[PDB]
Amino acid sequence: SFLLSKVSFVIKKIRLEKGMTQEDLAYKSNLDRTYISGIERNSRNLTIKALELIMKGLEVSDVVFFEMLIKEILKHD
Amino acid sequence: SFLLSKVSFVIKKIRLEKGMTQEDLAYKSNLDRTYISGIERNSRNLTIKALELIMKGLEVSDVVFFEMLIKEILKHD
């Protein structure tokens, strides 16, 4: 769906804005690299806990993440 | 965490605002009643797909859900 695609999109966008590789985000989020690579392809099975760990490893607040997600939904869906 | 607690909080708040029982939301979200009851206690393992199904079964847009979540984080965390 559009929402699944844009959750993965926003995670990859912030990660690249911070200059982080998938390996850097894996180490910082406590989730292994094939998990990060999988979630960025398809967020269907990403859990709210894993998403909190990723926001922490990105050093982005939950509020900012969700605001960037709402902007992408409003401007593109 | 605060975020896990407020995801469950916002789901239960909207469900009660719509006058729905847990059984009504289960039927409408395609998720069984013990899953709904579990997520409202602790959203740790709720997935983004299950959360999209719940927003659909609540007939709430993703944008509104996330806006209510940001308000609860900003005003209470």
Residue numbers in the entry:
A (entry chain A), B (entry chain A): 3 to 79
Which lines from the publication concern this structure?
The most widespread of these mechanisms employs a “controller” (C) protein encoded by a gene downstream of its own promoter, and usually co-transcribed with the endonuclease (R) gene as a single transcriptional unit. The C-protein binds at various sites within the C/R promoter to regulate transcription of its own gene and the associated endonuclease gene. Unusually, in the RM system Esp1396I, the C-protein also represses the MTase (M) gene by binding to the promoter at the transcriptional start site, denoted OM where the C/R genes and the M gene are transcribed convergently from different promoters. Flexibility in this loop is very important for DNA sequence recognition, as it has been observed in the nucleoprotein structures to adopt different conformations depending on which operator site the protein is bound to.
